[model samples]
Every structure is written in C-alpha cells, then in structure tokens.
Target: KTTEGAFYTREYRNLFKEFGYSEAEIQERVKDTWEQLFGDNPETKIYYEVGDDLGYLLDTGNLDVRTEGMSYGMMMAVQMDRKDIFDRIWNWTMKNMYMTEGVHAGYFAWSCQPDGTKNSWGPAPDGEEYFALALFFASHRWGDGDEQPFNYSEQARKLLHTCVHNGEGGPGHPMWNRDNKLIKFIPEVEFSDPSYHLPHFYELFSLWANEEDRVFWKEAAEASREYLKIACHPETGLAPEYAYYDGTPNDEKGYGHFFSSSYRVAANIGLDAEWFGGSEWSAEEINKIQAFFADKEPEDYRRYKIDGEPFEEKSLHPVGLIATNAMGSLASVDGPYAKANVDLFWNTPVRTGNRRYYDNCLYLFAMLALSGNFKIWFP
Candidate 1:
C-alpha cells in the first residue's frame, strides 16, 4: 500500500460495499457464486469430473473443452486455493491439448473434444498467456512438486519461452510478434485480439520467466499497454475482436466489431489499472466504456460497430457484458455509470442454460476481482 493509497482504498473499494451491501451479504454472494459455478448446480455448473483425479470446465454449449475454459478454470482454482481442482485441469490440458509434434508443438490445441480428442491443431495466444500466468501463480501458491509436469514454475517458464521463441525451434511461429512485442491472436497470425492484452500478466512474467527472456516480457508489458490505446476507439472505448498492430480493426472474418470477444477489454483495463498504477488514461478509458452503455439495458445490448452502430443481432453474453462493465469499475474514478453498472451486476445472477458456461466464467472472474480476492501469490 502506498501513502497516497490504492486505486480504491478502504475495504478494497468492493463495489458491493459502496452499493450498500453489508460485509456478510458480500461474503454470501461471493461464496454462493463460487459454489454455483464449481458445485452441483445442474444448470450452471461448468466443472465436471472426468475420472478419479481429473476434472474439466466444459464449454457447455459446444460440448467440448477448450484451452480458454481450461486455463480460466485453473485461474479460478488457484485464486480460490483449490489445489486439487487446479492440478486436475492442468493435467487434463497437458494430456489432451498440449501439442507434442508438428508446427504447433509447444503450443496447446485451442479446441478439443470433451473426451480429450483434438478438435483443432491451431494455437490461440490468449490461452497460452493465461496458461502461463495461472501456472506461475500455482507455483507460488503451492510449492512445485518433485515431478515432471507438476513442476509448475519450470512449466510456466518453458511455456513463456516458447511463446517468444517457438519459431527458433524450426517450423512453428511464435505466439508473440517479436519485432513489435505484441501478442498475436494465434501463433501463425499477425493480428491481435484486444482483450488479450493483459499487461498485468506480462508484468508478472517479466519477473518470473527465464532470466534470459525477462527483458522481452518487460517490453511486452509496456507494449501491450500502449497497444490497447490504439485498438480501442477513443470516444466509444470499444475494441474489436481482432486488430492490426496499428490499432485498426482487422475485419477479415467480420471479427472487427464490439462483439463477444471484445467485452474483455474493459475488464482487462480495469485490472491493469488496479494492479500496475496504469497509464493516466486508464480510468478515463473505463469511464468511457461504462458511459457508452449507461442507457442500454442488458436486454437492449447488441452487437455493434466500435463506432457505436447497433446491429440487429443481440448480445449472446448479456450477463457477461454486465459483469465486465462492473469489473471495469475497478479503475473508474466515480464515473457517472460506474455505480449503476455495479448495481446491475449485483442484481444479476449467474446465467444458466446451454450458453451459461462462458457467461459464468466471466461472471466468476468479475466476482473475484470486485471482491478483492483475485490476488497475486508470490513465492
């Protein structure tokens, strides 16, 4: 804690508290959300037992396990201090998604069948980043086991090394654009996903990755922070699902809208500001996003152009939108819409039904962050 104080002082600025929730009420909400997500809630539970010692977070609608969900599962587990669940998710990922041969060898398969079959051979850089950070946290929270795969810190280091140096191994491309120091959407792609710019994670990687590569991670943290400004619209504060290094949306596959994948930009910025005393504009950026949606009810949420053009299509993740908007409050300095977003989130329950997996995953993350529980565990 600094003398000037944190971004939000006194009780962690838990939005719930300012919204008039008692400590007990906040505790109950936190505990209940965790249980519904990881426990026996038939409609909302994403965690499922695979065998005796393994479990996976299902992409419930697709009936598959993805590197995205699996990495997210490990993060939740580590934050909650659930070593068993964390280990199981990592084990399942290692057994199924870890590519052992070909151009993508050091990277994970982004998609896989529920029964541990590969659905795609390509690697998504977002997953690699999350996997590396989660493993690092796991190593710090629990000492690395005297075993191969369970050697958490080494595993994290190796993954980070591959992210930056995969092409050096011969045939594959690196997950990051080494020249610009920005993460790519995929190892073979030149574009980036705006939501994937988590400078806070890069800051940690600089400290924990192999000594030879530490400078790269440090530069990456600085690069990502600057890159985000380009990717997001100045006024609307919307980012595209994919963008060029210069910050313009890459509409190749029509992914250049403020759609599903774009929502994370708000959440990411909030965390960066909270963790790193982010750029002077961080709080203002979050305020713009919240202000953009202030009048749009969740039901009115829709896919839109980054310039704020609404489409006929509806948001597939309204709960997720609410969650991120509220999580964005972590950086917002009493913005006009901040308290409103937090109030909306407090009243919204975790989504249920076939599409609940993604929503709840984001929901829990927001819950952890807003409650001051999503923390760093140092060795």
Candidate 2:
C-alpha cells in the first residue's frame, strides 16, 4: 500500500534506459554531463567553490550569483549526495544573500555580485521555493549540522513560515498569493512566472512546513496544478514566462512569450509526474511540447507566442529547450516525437559559451531526471 506512487515506489523512470541504451552508457552520460557543468574546466564550469566553505553558480551570461542559480545548485548537490558542495553553496548563500534587516528580512537577495554584494533588495519566489525544497532534501539526505546555517530542516521550515506569514502587519508580502494560492514571480509582484509553479515541491512543503501552514501548501499545490492547465497553451503547450493568477499571459514587459524561463515548464512536469503519477492532463501537455519541437532543430529554436506563433528572434538556450523536451518524455506517452527528442538530447553536449550557465543548469537537471537520479529523500 505504501508503494502507491513513484514517491513510494521509488521508481524514478529512466527514459534513457528504456530507450535501449546500456546501463553503463547511461551512467557515464550522466557523469559526463555533471562534470561538464560542475567540473574545473574554465570553459564550461558553473559551480565554483570559494575557499573551504563557500561556493556559488556564476551566471556566466550575467556575471552574477543569483539566488535562482544558488538554490538550484544546492538542489543539484543534495540530489547528487555531495554534502560538501551543498554546504559550500548554502554557506555562501546565507553569508552573502540572506537579508537580516529590511522588508525582505528572512529572504535571500535574488541577485548578488560574485564577491557578495547585493544587486537587488527584492526576493524572487522561484528561488525561495527551490531553496525550501532543497534545504529539506539536504536535511533528509544528510543529518543537519549543529550550526545556524547548517540547520537545514530548521532553516527550510522557517523560510516557508516566512514565505506565508511575513506580510501579516509586516513590511514584506508573502511570496504566494494567499487568495488564489499561486506563487508570485517575486514576493511583491502581483503576477507569477509560470515556471515558478511547482506543485510537487509544494506538496512536500505541505508535509514539512509548520503545522499552521501545511494546509495552505496543500491547497497551493492543487491550485498550481489547475493553474498550469490554463497557463500553458492548449495547442502549443507553451507557457508564458509570466502570467496573471487567472492564467492569462501578463505581457506588460514582453515576457508573455515562450522564452528562457518557459523551458522549465517541461522539466517540472516530468519530475512531478515521475513522482506523483501526474494529473490527467500532464502527459498530454508534455506530449504536445515534444511534438511541437520535433520538427525543429536546436539551431532553429525561436521565441514563440504561447499560441505557437514564432518570432524572428532565435532562442537563447536552444540546447536547454532540447533537454527539457526530452525530459518531458518522462510524463509523455509513447510517441515518435518523444523518442526523437530524447535521441537529440542524448547526442547533445553541455553548452560552453557565455550563456552556458542557464542552459547547462537545465541540461544537467534534465539529465538527472532522465537518469532516474533526481529523487526525493524521505526521512
């Protein structure tokens, strides 16, 4: 009875293995993808360990350490069982980005200089969301340390408490819209980034957050799942980078199109489905995304309206899109497009240019998911 879902079954579906690739080859592919992204090669390195106990993922394209990347890097570390790297990244994040006195207190600054100067006073909800999830995982995978920054579970639970309760007669607003249960792009924003909605993580947060907030997270997870049905295009399966709570694209700043952040929608769908068996519409939505990209090569990836209207601007992270499309196969049913996308991703390599940071992060995540290594650590 406990094996009710992949969460209980512990069956991280390995699409690469299912596609007839040998186990050794699949293992090596995942290893190489990790090294390329986190290794010492200056040409492709993203994870940089600062001294003995600090590390960060540099946004090579932007020359900054963003909470988005830092929390993501921490998530990657915990999943890979690299506690050293996890502690390093977490230390750097707490030491550099944690805001102590302000409306944003208890939140990490979204962006910082590599040397630890705050670039923005605001907190990005996506980063906070990832931070909470990753910290919980770290606590489960490795027992918490005795220090302030290393109290992983405590830190995560406190953050989630702040995420929901900060605005009660306070300065900073909550990251999620309490009325609708949708996550805002930032704590102060009225709209959301479609990619920021991770019901899978929220589900876990519901279980682990403070007792008073657990029900809120449970409802938030359901709300996010329903929100995605409308946020994503019915035909194209593309989600706008940012949208209103009602699921309409919020195009105020030209972010209404399927661009960089839009790529994560597929990867998230894959992981959520892998863990929870997916909602009724999940596989169908992912299949549409795979089919949409089947006819297009990475070089031809274009910015597109969520309705499938292509723009002249080429994609900034074509390989990232390619990885996400393949990752979606975990949730999608048998199909030529799904198979083809996996084939394409298997042949692709991690990016090495100035824009490599974001693309490789996505690429590595997709690799982890496909390899059946992106898993939950239950304690």
Candidate 3:
C-alpha cells in the first residue's frame, strides 16, 4: 500500500485535473508549451527543418547536433504526433551519425557537428536507448519506412541486439554488462550512471526485443530497479552521476555528486511508478527529494553530494532541477512540498540564455508529462 494511494496500473493521471485545473486550462497550458518549443519561440525552438528533406534538434549552447538531442526530438515529435518532424530528424540522424564502419559499426556517434561531421566515433547508451524507443514508437504510429534506415522496427531490433551482444566477437564493446544487465556509461566502461536507469523503457523493450532476447529485457528492468534502490541515498533521495555496481559513488573526474545528470532520476522514478505498479518506493523516494528541496528556492539550488551535503557551487541547471522536481509529483502524494514544486514550475517560463537548450528540453518534457499528454503511442 502506498502512502499516497494504490499503485497506478498503467493508468495515466490527468495531473492538471488532479491538481484542480479545468480541462480548458490544462489544454491551454500544454498547447502553449508545445507552441513555445515547436512554434513561435525562436530562442527555444531547438527543432530545425533543413530545406525540405531533413530536420535536427540542436544543442544550441554548444551548436552541435547530438544523438541526445536528435533522439529526444524524435520522441517529442512522435509523442506529439508530428510524423513529418520525426521522419526528418530520423533522416538527418541516419545520414550523419549512424556509423557503418570500424569499431562502432551499428551504433550512432554520440556527437556531431551541426553540418553533420563526426565529433566522436563513440556511442552513448542513453542516446541509443532513446533512439530505439522513439523509432519503435514511430513504427507503431506510422508504419515503417520503405527502406533500411527508415525501417523503424528493424532498425530498433538491430540496435538493441548490438547493445547487448556487440562485444562477443567484435571490436566494439557492448553498451551493457551482459552478466549484470546494468547499462554502462559507455560501451567501454563498466560503471553506470544512476540517471540512466529506465526500467519503464526496458519493460517495453521486453515486449519488442528479439524473441530470444525478451528475457534479458525483463531481467534488465528488475535489475535496474534494484540498482536504483542501492544507488539513491536512502535519506536524501539523491543519486550520483556515476556509481559502481556496489552502489558506491564513482568519483572519477568528480562526477560522484547530485548534479545535472542526476536530476533525471526523479523524472524517471515518477514515470516508472506511473507505468508500472511494482514500486511503491518510487512515490516515497520522490517525496524525499521534494521535501529536501522544499525550503530551497530554485536560485539557491546547488550541486551536492547524494547524502544531501551542499557544495559551494551553484547549480548550472537550476531550471532543470525545478522542472524534474515538479515532474516527480506525478508519483508523489499530496503534500506541501509537492504542491509547492508544481506551483513554482507553473510560474516559471521556459528558460532562456546560452544554457536554454537543456533546461527547455527538460521543461517541455515535464510539461508534457504532467499535463497528461506524454502517452504511449500503441501499435
């Protein structure tokens, strides 16, 4: 039994209505946010259409096209039912980032120049996972493209296969550890980023992956849930950016703190609880995080150790922190902090400045999710 209520069984709550907004008001909010990102707000419009054939999302601060942003753009497009935009982004990704040679064959280069030059040959597992899921959704929603790269389900299957089996007899390493089922920070690295655990996505992968690989995806979902329990601090509900299998913070390059990447854990937990009912703990976990930040306003948000100790450094992505904290309420009980977070988020506009890309991306996601628009596009 949850302190909030019974577990939600794939039943998405219209959180706006739950929070006492009218249907019109909720629709207006979602429409406004969508328009801001994809319509009018030029500064926040990361989605760009290239002439007539291609499109890409830009990491505007760095001025690059990333597997990260491109995949995220596809997801946003598919979820919003914008097939044209999704196809454009996919076309651009296939032409630019998809590697077909050497050690990284079958994987997308994690970063690329805006003009589509390879910035690095390495793959980020996070990007691959997002790309696969978005592609799967695109296929279910609009059927596959007529050819190879556009063959959504076929492409997703191949990528997932490589993620689990790349290293067996190849020069490229697998994105995940086969024995443990934990996703690695990179194919060559054995360590994990706490924010990378997405058991909800893995559950879907279990249904969609190759028949022989179905069991692995289910196991991966369970393993990620358990790993999250160990990785998140029990008291503070914070996770490090990187951690060893044993749950100790991996301090290499001083990433062992609650910072930018760590913010996503709250959003993931909230969505996991929304989709799957197994984890009553997720609600409580979100509560702890919300409560911890209840008294701290966004401007005061700072980098910190997972145990809740603050560093002298202020958060570079305070808008993102606020956005995720508000998103966490999707799985939380009615409380002062939860209400406060939503209120704070409601008043805040999409971020602007050099760092607008990341903050606005997370902002739009939180907006979509909490407003009851981020639904699964079923086949």
Candidate 4:
C-alpha cells in the first residue's frame, strides 16, 4: 500500500537522494503489483483495478486479496497524493464493498465474491477494524469537517462505538476464532484477542476523533491494556493471541509466544510516536503506548527512535527493506552506503517469499511516490 509522500516531508527527502528511486520506478512497480493483485483484468477495472478478492471467508476465496488491493489502492491514492487513483478507488469501494443487511452491514464487507456475495476471513471486528482505519484516514484526509459523509466514516465510527460501548452485561466483545467457519457475527462469548480490538482503538482515538468518541475508545483500550499487561510479563511483556476477560494469558505451554505486542507497544508509547508526539511514555497514556510498536513497524514506525536510534530495524521486514534499500540507491538517509544494506536482502538468508519481498519493494516505491519523497521531489 502506498503511503502519501507529500505528508512525510522529512522521510521522503532522505528517501529519494539517499535511496536510488525515480517516478518511473515507483509507477512501474505499482503497475506490476496491481497486475499480480487482480490478474490485471481490463474489464474489471473498478478504478485502478478490481477483483473479487475481498475476504474469501478466511481460507475459502481470496476475499482479503481484493480488500487488501483496495487498501493498497486507497493507501496509494491518499499517501501518494494520487488524486486520480485515490478518487477512483474510493468511489469504486463505495459501490462494491459497502453493503446493507449483511453481517457486515454499515461498514464495508470483509470482501465480495464475483457474484457479489460477502466472502473473507470475516474477522468480524478484525477485518472491519482495518477497513474502519482506512476509511477513518480517508475521511480525515478528505473530510470537510461535519465528517466526510460521503466516505465510510460513519460506518467506521459506528463499528468502533459498538466495540467501545460493549458495557459489561451487553453482548460483550464479538465472539470469534477457530470453531466457527461461517465467518459471521456469533453471539457466544468467545476468546478475545488483543490484535482485533487494538487496531481500531489504537489507530483512530489519537487523530481526528471527538472527545466523546475518544473517551469510549480510551476506556475500552484501557481495559484491554490492563488485561494484556497482567497476562504479559513486565520483562518480556509478551501477550498471546487469545485470552480470557479476567486478564489471564492463554498460552498452549501456559506461556507461549506473546503476540499482543502492538497493543503492549501502543500501551507504552502514545498512539503518536513519543518524540514525534512530544510526550513521555506513560502507562495510561494510550497514544504513547501505541508508539512502542509504531516505531517497530515499517509505515507507522518513525524515522528515529527514543534511544536516539535510527530506523535500522527496517532490515527486519523484507518488504520495508526493499523500499528502504531502493531509497538508498537514490540518496542516503544516513549516508551513501545506507541503501546498499537493503540490496543484500536479495540474496540474504531472510528466505522470504516472493510476495512479501516484492510487495514491500513496491510498497517502498508507492510510499515514496505518495509521500512525494521520491528523489525527484525537490530541487
């Protein structure tokens, strides 16, 4: 997905000159990525392209394929400032994904089939959460106050509010996971996962939300955060994927891999990056908590770290590494040899799949374009 270049001024400047990238490179990569995405169908060009890869009911079809495509397109449009792409993708998403009466009513569907039926992992809140985030960003980017009524902002708010207002006796967090195959909302009280809820609350509360909505998300996130902390140890602070409401960590080994990092990170750092947001990390400072992982992830992670460390962690993720490397060829975020580090990944022991590697490569390019950070952005 393309992150807007115009918005990330500081990063883009370093991206182009430090890395070796050009408008042609970005556009070419974008085309390749899009083609692999939807088989590059000519007739089904909703905007940039279209396909029935929305949700796929998790493992059934390629639902997320299409949804992710839209996500990529949306990210490209807004992040890259591609008005043509952004505008077309937004309109097409509204026409195709937005459904009524389905389990995913109000918000966009997980994904749609060729026949236009709902299909996708039906992560229920999880998938919807990502959808809401994109729409929320879209609204903020394009909204004229009063919220962007045209976009899915209303749907996003409604979905988020539902999660926030899960007042104890109410239905309680939407039940999900293994047992169910239909991929629709189930009333049963199922194991809750941090990743599902954190994205919605962690992502939206900080930016563009009103005080009222912010409070709801804050409380919900706090409750989740507390559970995560107790379940996660102070040292590793490792959180599992599933857990009970009583702050108990669910691990197969009674202590398994702690994956609730984004939540814990968000809990420690604010939603905005600590230094970037201009605040010290606090336990209850929800926004700051999110910053912990924000610095780790490619897009959300900042150019710098609290310990005065640069984003060399970019080496961890292959996709981001490609983007980071490509930028190096053009200029030097740190120096002339910085981008060279990324090149080594091509033959490194990372052993990543083609999809992950190339996608990230294109992501870097798209992000550079969207950010207007490609080497050619300035004099």
Candidate 5:
C-alpha cells in the first residue's frame, strides 16, 4: 500500500503513458466516479446477489447502490454538498441492519435487501466488516473536513450493534445472502483480511468515532489480525483460501473456483472482446489471485508461470508463479495486461459492447475522471 508502485512496474507505467496519468487525470477520474454514481440519482444501493442486476439505478428510480453507498454518501456529503442523501442512507442502514441481539454480536449485517431483509451469506463473521470500514473512512474523510451534521459517532454505534466474535471469544466469520441466510463460518484460511481490515478500521474509529467505538474497532482489528497471522502458511507466506476463525487450515490448497481478481480479469477481457464486441462476461467468472506477501522478504512473492506454478514451489502451479514474477516485470516495464487496461477506454478497439458495464468501463470512468476529460464532472 505504500506506493502501489510495486503493483504497477515502470514498464507498465511507460506502456500507458499515452493514456495519461498526470494529477489532472486522477482529479478528473474522481469527479467522473462521483458523477456517475450520484449525478443522476442521489441514492445508491448495493445488490449482493449475482443474479440481480438492478441496472444502473435502484429499483426505486433513486440513484443509489450498496457497494457504493458508504463511499458515495461520504462523497456526496463532501464533494457534492448532498447532505440529505448521506443522512438518508445512514439512517436506512441503522433501522435495517442494527439489531439489539445478534448471534455473535456488535456487528452489522453485510447488506440489506430493498425489502429490508438482512443479507446473511458469507463465512458469517468477517462478512459485513467492510461496510463498517467504508463508513468509518467516509465519516472521517468527510465529517472532519466539513463538520457536517452527520454523526460518524452514531454510525460507529450502529456498526457495533452486534458482537462479531462467535460467542466463542474469537472472531466469527459470517457469510450470508440477501435474506441474511448463513452459508459458512470461519470456514477458510484468510491471509490478508485481519491485518488489512482490522487495523485500518481501528485507526478510523479511534480518530473519528467516540472513545467506546474506538476501542471496539481496535479490538475487532486486533482479534482478526491475530487469527490471520496464525493462519499464515510459513512456506508460501500466503493464507490458504479457506480456514477456520481459529486459523486452522481447511482441506484442499484451494477451494473457491475463481478469485476476485479473476472476475476483474474477465471484466477486462469482456470489455476488449465485446467492445469491438465479444462474448458475454465469463459465465464462470474466475481470475487469478494475487498476493504481495508484504510481510515476507521481497523474494517470497515469487513469479507465477504459465502452467500456474510459482518460482520456489514446483507443485504450486506454473501460470500463477509466472504472473507473480511477471507482476514485478509487468510493473517495471511496458507489458501486455497493464498496457491493455490503461488504454482500454479511449481506444475503441478495447471498448466493445456495453464497455460501461464491464470492468473496462471501470477503467474508462477512472481514466476519464482522472483526465478531466468531461465537461460535466468536477471534484
């Protein structure tokens, strides 16, 4: 996270120089994202179910979405001076997700369906944590700056409405669906979440929330991190894809069919294929997973090869290893994937059918906003 420089090599940076990465571009992109999310409608809802594509707008014609809600609320409060929307979402969340008594306790559900049902699909413990973190970030980033009437303090209370530790005194992983149905529990190895989510959330709370809320976020991060560090595979410096909250290893080196990055990759590919026109998004969306293993020595994040193997381990898989190594090279030099992603938007060859919906559109919106290319968008 330090520079994000390692994530993209110099070679890759040079490759996309033509697309523009100056400060001006980044500013424009931020504006573009803001406008795209809030310009049309003030409300944004997140649809967790893969099957429910509620189009760009919410079913209610309000411009809102779930994933974008917290961030967008903060964005509206600060960037667009849209205070009402921010207040509305925060209130909606409290009324829906915050409960007096929860299974584990002190945490909120992952998502709430339009009809007010809570989502309960995930490991059942670590699932809804991201939303709390996002809210914390939004509150701190915007509230401190604007002194808006919004109470991140109250938001903190709502976030802690349920206890997250599985009544067992440890982090409880909760995975649920739109209706809040339980799917799994501390079921897999998690290498990065505790360290990544907890600390950040703690920091956010300590600074922006009340003293009690600050303590809660800190403990949450600490407990989650302890488990993650324990689950760390000494050899790979990678967490097995699945694990128990106790950090116990699960069967199989891998369980989930595709990684989040896989969906990202497919999104990119579909943009290129269909823009000029290609196949529907990968029906079976799966992309390669990436790990920086920042805690380990630099040498540990070895290259992934074509056959999905990594450098030090012959049996790990070649292509992934090659990619891992290429990850370094790709960032350092102009390379295929990097160049393609940077140039995706403006280059018509990359903008196939409905590029806006594909991940390519994500880049497109990003680049366009960053570049200040639009007349309507402003930071």
Candidate 6:
C-alpha cells in the first residue's frame, strides 16, 4: 500500500464541507446531533444515566444493554471529547459486562439485562475491538487516572493481548484466528461477520496494542482489507451479514444475505479509506454499492442477494443504511451518486420510534465522520 494513514498524515477530509455545507452549518449539525444522542432528547437520545458515575446506551428495540451498544457509546463519547460520558460508560461496562471466570474469563459479556445481569456469557469481538479502540482513545485524549478502570491505556492493551493470545494452553478462546488474522463473530465461533472486519481500527490497533501483538494487528489490517474484496460482491458491493473466512456467505443460521450487520461494511470501507487512503478496489467498490441504491428511496430499501436480487421483506434499518451509504462518500467522492447521497442524507431525519436506537447511532456516526469529526486519538 503506497498510502500514509491519517494518523501519520494528520489530514481528515471533510466531505460535507466539500459538498457545500457551510462551516457554521456543519458545526451546528455536529453539536446538535451530539446533544440529541447523548441526553434525554425524546426522539434521538440513546444514552441513559444510571447513577452518579455510571451510564449506558439503551438498545431501544431490544431493550437491553448489548456490549455492542455500550462499546459504540464509549467510542462516540471519546471521539466527541466527552471524558465524563466516556468514563461513565466504561464504569457501567466494567461493572456489568466484565466476565471474571470460566472459559470466557477476561472478556465482557455480550448481552446484559437492564439491571446489570448477564444475558449471555460469551464475548462479541465487535465490542471487544471497539472497546479496546475507545479505551485507547480515552487514555490518549485524557491521560490515565491513578488506578483500576481509570487506567485506560493498560485496560486497552490487556484486552488486546487477551484477544490475540488467549487459548494458548488456556481455558479461554482467542477472538481472532491465529492463522487468518480475521476476527470471529465471537471468540468460540469459526465464522465471521463481514461488518466486523474493520481495517481502519486495526491499523490503529497495530500501533497501540502491546508490543508483542503489534505485528498481528498489522497483518490483520491487510488481511481484512483483502478479505473484504472477496467478502463483498464485485458487482453490487453487497456483503453477507455473516460469512466464512474465505468470504463466502455462511447461511447456516439464515444471516447470510445483506442485512443490518452488512450495512457497516460500506461505512467501514469509507473510514478505512478516510484514515488510511484505501486501495483502488475500495474506491470502486463503495461506488458500486452507492450506485446500487441511487434510484431507491429509504422506503424502497430491502434485503438483497450480493448479486442484487431483492427480498420481499422491507429493511429494518433503512435510515441506518442511508447513513452508511452517505458515509461511503468518504472514499467514493468522485462517484456519480456521491453528492446526491449526501444530499439525501442531509434531507432525512434521524430515525425515531422503538427501532430508532441502531438507526440513530449510525446517523450520528455518519454525521461525525462526514464533518471530519470522527478521529483517531494518538498518545
């Protein structure tokens, strides 16, 4: 790769400003969207305070605390320079999700009831990866506190170490495959979720993870970038929600087609390119997907085959889909629909109602990224 990542180049392209949104409008939108999601805004807010020092982002549709939601909250807080919110989420996560014993020891629980009880004992690597990344940002942005949970840097490195080195004559399983360098859907699973491959985040992890694990993250970054070329269809750029490491859709559990988890692949590619100046192939791929939906309205979005065959069931998260396609413009700025996609995104409101949590989460993330606000925090 002949590209320098943004962490080194220190250049984050602002697609929104380039698309003609004034600096004032961009600033207002970023802050307003930030406030909407972080507080008691009835329509868009997700984060809920628990006590003096704890908070959690609710999964409105699911009505539980997922490691996925919590980790994303940690990430959102850190990116927006909210140390209080960041620490509160971390505290809630450590108290509620941290597993202490058994084969999954040292990993956070994937799901927990609202009252802080584990709904599942296993770890989700998507959460692990995001948690580790956010914790690293916390340490870099705010420096470490005196001890324990406030020791953000140490917590991140330790979590990474466990992800790579667990199950080496031990009771627990490693989150990643030692040979493929691909993260699994869960530590115990052999399959992978296509959206879970985040080379942009992995590029940072390579440098921030423990010294012994640095090379692993580096290889992982490249592997995922390459893995996506196969995982995502060349024709439509659609990727299955879950797939084998070979990049073939794994329909064993009926999660094989493009769906909620698959939506992030486009968003991930945009960030990978934004942060790392991604491959020529990605420039073409993201364009294809954006084009695939160019004629469709949010009401027209639906499940589809990677080959572009449509399913009858309407999409559960069309607003989230629109959000990610808009984010895709980061890499495909020259694509014909890029401007229209951004305009459409600007026109749509952040979702509301019981299913709003996931849509609104993607909405604000796309908002931050388009405004050059989603960033890497270097220590």
The numbered model that scores best in lDDT is: 6
Question: Please, what's the RMSD in Å of model 6?
Answer: 1.1
**lDDT per residue as tens, model 2, 6-35:** 787887888888988889999998888888
Best of the two (3, 4) by lDDT: 3
What are the clash counts of all predictions, listed in order? 0, 0, 0, 51, 88, 0
Worst 10 residues of 5 by lDDT: 278-287
Candidate 2: C-alpha RMSD after superposition:
1.6
Worst 10 residues of 6 by lDDT: 1-10
1-379: candidate 6 lDDT, tens digit per residue: 3356576788787899999999998898888888888876988788898878999998999899998899999999998899999989999999989999879999999888889999989888999999999999999999999879889999999999999999997778999999999999988889899899999888889898899999999999989988999999888999999999889999998899989999999899888888888567887888899889987778989999888899998899999999999998888777788899889998888777899899888899899889888898887
Give the per-residue Cα lDDT of candidate 4 at 25.
61
Q: Which tens-of-lDDT digit does each residue in 1-379 have in candidate 3?
A: 2422212343567776787768887788877877877776886677778978798888878888888788889999888999888889999999999999978898999899888999999988888999998989999999998976789989999899999899688688988899999999988888999888888889889999898889999999999999999999999999999999888799889999999899999988876766664246887788889988977868888999999999989998888889898888877746557777777888888877777777877888888888877766657
**Alpha carbon lDDT of residue 363, candidate 2?**
90
Task: Report lDDT (CA) for all predictions.
Answer: 0.87, 0.89, 0.84, 0.39, 0.34, 0.89
Q: Rank the candidates by lDDT, best first.
A: 6, 2, 1, 3, 4, 5
lDDT of 3: 0.84
Model 1 lDDT per residue over 189-298, tens place = 78889999998899889999999999999999989988998888999999999999899999988999999899898888777666666455777888888889987889
Candidate 2 residue pairs in clash (backbone atoms < 3 Å): none
TM-score of predicted structure 1: 0.96
Ranking by TM-score: 6, 2, 1, 3, 4, 5
- The true-versus-predicted C-alpha distance at residue 210 of model 6, in Å, is 1.0
Superposed model 3: Cα runs more than 4 Å off: 1-10
Which segments of candidate 2 are over 4 A away from where they belong? 1-4
Candidate 6 ranges beyond 4 A from true positions: 1-5
Q: What is the lDDT of residue 253 in candidate 1?
A: 88
